[PDB]
Symmetry: D2
Subunit: 381 residues, 4 copies
């Protein structure tokens, strides 16, 4: 295989991949424009798409990503499970790299919230989880190696595509509101029913109907779950406060190579506010206007759901702007790629089937550019 470290692509919020997608549904990594996993494999590259929770928190998604790669049964931590009120153990993953350990590395590419998930999992690998450490010391038992800390030389690169490193007003003012969270969780409850084949990612909260449980008792049982009031969900983590908590508990690993990509899809109106361009995917037309009418000017330019000031880099970690041809092989610092003009949040993954300005060849070059950069990380070591 042409890349020496496996590339793992990490979908964001709402993402469903592989056989976990519904019967008719767009293919997350590339749409019908560039089938990323398919084609990059055809070109001789070793690539994989992680399947992690679509509605869960960054913490819960970061744990699940680790088991997708390593294999095993998900262990969210005994302290975490106790503090937020959900199950400790989850799905079991075969694992794309059973012998993943210090020495065998991966490249991590994340779109949207996948970027935040990749950061939080590397943090656990490097610095551990101090609550699970204090718990395992005080009550014995077993601790997942994800929370032990001390592990290095396992992640070669972290690359983010339209990742809300600083959150988004579309979460604060819409997605994290009571009424909207109730809609998301009602969808999860329904997709937990005993006929359902797709996992929306919150079954650790109880959203799995048992085969001889009536829906009436299912409603009654899960209405007592702590999810309805919890911050351990994706909608909270995507808020400005939610993302600042993650910025404040993560740090730069001097050995990893960091890159961000950002799209802008708005245009300035005669008053200074930003409105979605035409061809901004129609489902983000309203969130784009919420972001674009912020009271702070520097928070207005956006890709539909992420303001540009959020996508460029975390606001408390160091960064350096980079041109499109400048080798992005620096380690320990966020290299901020030039904002791609005209790309909305989902043009990065090709699922905007209504935008005939964004064609396949363009997306193939973009993903070939990312792979090329990663291959240069491998050679400069």
């Amino acid at each position: 295989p042409l890349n020496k470290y496996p590339v793992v692509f990490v979908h964001g919020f709402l993402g469903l991949v592989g056989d976990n997608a519904p019967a008719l549904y767009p293919n997350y990594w590339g749409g019908n424009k560039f089938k990323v996993i398919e084609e990059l494999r055809k070109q001789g590259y070793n690539v994989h798409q992680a399947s992690v929770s679509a509605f869960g928190s960054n913490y819960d998604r970061a744990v699940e990503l680790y088991y997708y790669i390593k294999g095993g049964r998900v262990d969210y931590g005994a302290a975490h499970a106790a503090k937020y009120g959900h199950e400790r153990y989850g799905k079991t993953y075969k694992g794309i790299m059973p012998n993943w350990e210090p020495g065998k590395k991966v490249h991590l590419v994340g779109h949207s919230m996948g970027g935040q998930t990749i950061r939080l999992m590397e943090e656990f690998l490097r610095n551990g989880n101090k609550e699970e450490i204090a718990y395992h010391k005080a009550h014995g038992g077993e601790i997942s190696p994800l929370f032990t800390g001390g592990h290095n030389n396992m992640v070669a690169s972290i690359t983010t595509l339209a990742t809300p490193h600083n959150g988004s007003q579309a979460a604060d003012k819409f997605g994290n509101t009571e009424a909207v969270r109730k809609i998301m969780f009602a969808l999860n409850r329904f997709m937990g029913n005993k006929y359902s084949n797709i996992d929306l990612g919150l079954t650790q909260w109880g959203f799995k109907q048992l085969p001889n449980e009536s829906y009436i008792d299912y409603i009654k049982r899960v209405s007592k779950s702590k999810i309805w009031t919890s911050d351990d969900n994706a909608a909270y983590d995507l808020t400005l406060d939610g993302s600042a908590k993650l910025n404040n508990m993560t740090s730069m690993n001097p050995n990893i190579t960091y890159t961000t990509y950002t799209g802008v899809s708005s245009h300035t109106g005669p008053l200074g506010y930003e409105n979605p361009d035409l061809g901004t995917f129609f489902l983000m037309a309203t969130t784009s206007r919420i972001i674009g009418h912020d009271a702070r000017e520097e928070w207005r330019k956006n890709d539909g759901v992420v303001p540009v000031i959020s996508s460029l880099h975390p606001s408390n970690q160091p960064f350096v702007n980079v041109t499109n041809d400048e080798p992005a092989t620096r380690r320990g610092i966020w290299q901020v790629k030039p904002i791609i003009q005209g790309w909305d949040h989902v043009d990065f993954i090709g699922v905007d089937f209504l935008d005939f300005k964004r064609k396949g060849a363009e997306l193939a070059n973009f993903y070939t550019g990312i792979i090329n950069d990663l291959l240069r990380v491998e050679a400069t070591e």
Copy 2:
């Protein structure tokens, strides 16, 4: 594992299993009543559910079943592909038993048309395919080992559940009619579209839209396929003539153990005709009446879609009736188990969620009885 030979369960017509089922859809092997693959594994048994074409012919399904077990890329045969006008190569399967060969055996359990599929594939293993042999002699190239013949000691048992060994009038008078076949194929065309994640089993006929092909050209392209007029489809094979072709080209293997199971779900009206019982799954209410009003009396009693005279055994192969406690360890002869009164065609697989007379415990005992019989085949050898 408690069974020395793997058990492979083979769904019938319309069946979708595993991650090939739509988002909300009943689980084929057991419904919500007894999760066959799940539970039998829990009990220490090695079991698998084959995923073969849901609308394809017995020939096409038999080829695909062989590759599901052995692994590899489906090869329908160069003569067959040329004669019926569809692709020669199909899906690639990982394979549950890569080293399957004379010496390592499987048990085969088939529901409905899966029974006919299991018979046709064993026939190929034992006696080959004379057309593919004559073709490979005349044009060289490669022949699949499925069509070579001479292979024995690879199938320990063949068990059928409500299998239409002699066809069904529900195919002759409804499912194989022009108008109905056009509906089935239109569904396959639509499920071939570029957003679709589920394989209905006729893509070798061209029913896969290419990613940059408009639906308008897709319609135009596949309207030229030979499927619309072909007999190489499931609806033809389930007809009385269709099944008699299969009976006339299969034979008993003296070393395999053969068993049939049959349900009756009709009751006799005051004129001699048969009407569906209440609790006969409502989607077979009309087909049940078509079968039950046949002009021949012995063709009327039925399970909803298969007449009892069809399910008991092929009409030209030898048989012996057997009690429910009689050891069914005889080889080379169809052992006809006692007709289960009150079971319709889908009570055998537990998906009749509207029949509260058919409970889980009853289905668990049935599948435990089949496994027990198979374990006795293993020990008497």
Copy 3:
């Protein structure tokens, strides 16, 4: 010229959608495919109609709407009611089937399920008015709907209820009226108020209509302030024991009206004395049937799927007399309780259960022929 002197008005229950207001594929409420009540009764020479009123609203809101369905005009829920519960005073405009409806021109009212209660409340309005609206008009002026004035009699010739939860149902107390289930119902109503929706689930007076230029984000935010989420002014509450008893405690017998109830039983005594649903109970009531059948009071267990037998026979302490199915049911001022129908569940009364082939259409046709023959005998004996 119609064979019945007074029009028969059939009034659907909770969740019922009729006529053009039903989804593109959806069963036909009055008769399913088994006996098309309106179609077939019209073919026989009878003047019959299908009222269309709120599927999820309170008995009060439904009773007002039923009056305007018959009379015609813009729905007026009352200024006092609207201010008390926090919804709009005016609703839809109806064409009206009897624009001339007035003392002397009567109707026969036939209600299924909640329809039975709605029909009772509308007659209370005609005879006695609504005390709170009368007092509001006396203190503030303005216009008062004549529905709320009282004194309007000889407008209803009969009231016939089929499987009506006169005394409530535990299926509402223990499930339908729970917090989680009211949220689901109200979410469904929010969604079918969206700007592309053609069907009216009956709660738009609470704000559940999305404006043409309003985003769904802003719609969600506007209606989340509606008092419907915490209000008792809805069907789920009125179907509880307390809700139905409040109606029982504010209605009275009209001595000129012919009252008749029909009741089904679809359960059987299990081993301990509890009731479980029969084979063939429509499967959507399998769990509600068990909830009712396992009540702690034994007299409350026998049921039709969703309505206990003791609730359908008659309002708790209103006068009643048990009748045989064949004797004349022309007594006035008293609930004539027809014998309990064995094997009929709650929806066997309206034929929509297409899965149950045991209940054929001829039998449902005889059942409606019986009601019309009874109604024709009310007319002949006044």
Copy 4:
């Protein structure tokens, strides 16, 4: 009292569903959410209506239905037509918006897409009758619908077409009228004739209504014998060049009627001289637009998504005069061709394209205000 002396009747095109006959979630045909034509024009004081006619039927079947939508009564397709094409003679009964419609009481007719052709054919019926029905009645007797007699004038004041394929469209010849696509349309019609369906796709005169007691198996078998599967008496054929030309060759100019066309262009000249769809063309016409734009004759390539420009301007060899958008359009007996609207695709005329935020509602409101102002000027100048 209405500001327009003659009612305006808007007539939808192919596939159009209006009012209560549309699915539970489905865009509103006349104006989308951008400008609710009927609602807003009524609010302004204008008497306007939304005709409801067959979505998939021929121009002939639609023109008959339009007449009964206006006049009232049971649709009579004609004994001769019914015997020739093999469908039923009688269809639905309409309430009628102008039961009094008769020489002296006029209407303004405004058609979008196929609606433009339907409106033309109905006026031919009123003025000249239908020769084949007249001859059938002379030879066999019986009753002949007055729609088919001829001699009924001064009933139509104006005919206005918006994006009407007067001369056909290659989108029908090369796609919509193909064997495979007609089968899909007819299958959709079979299915929405099923016994649970509430929406009428316009082909039930061909047998596509499942009886209440008939199994779907038997329904499929009965309607598979219908002549609709091989008939030309349907919209798909009438929208081809030959189909539209047959209508052109059997219509004539009425000297008292005011004729007006509007046309959109949504394509741009590609590198070779072919036309490709603009960014913002409604995506369902992306492929049809390219089919039209790559025609071998250059004058046939410019298009709005589904109708070529040369087809919308006016019927091929019927008299026409090009007008500016501001001059009085009160000439009678001649197609007044309004200037081609740049950037408007086929559905921008009716506002249903919710994805295209560039075409806002104020602009669509001005467009309908222009039509009504033109219609009011027809009335003032007679």
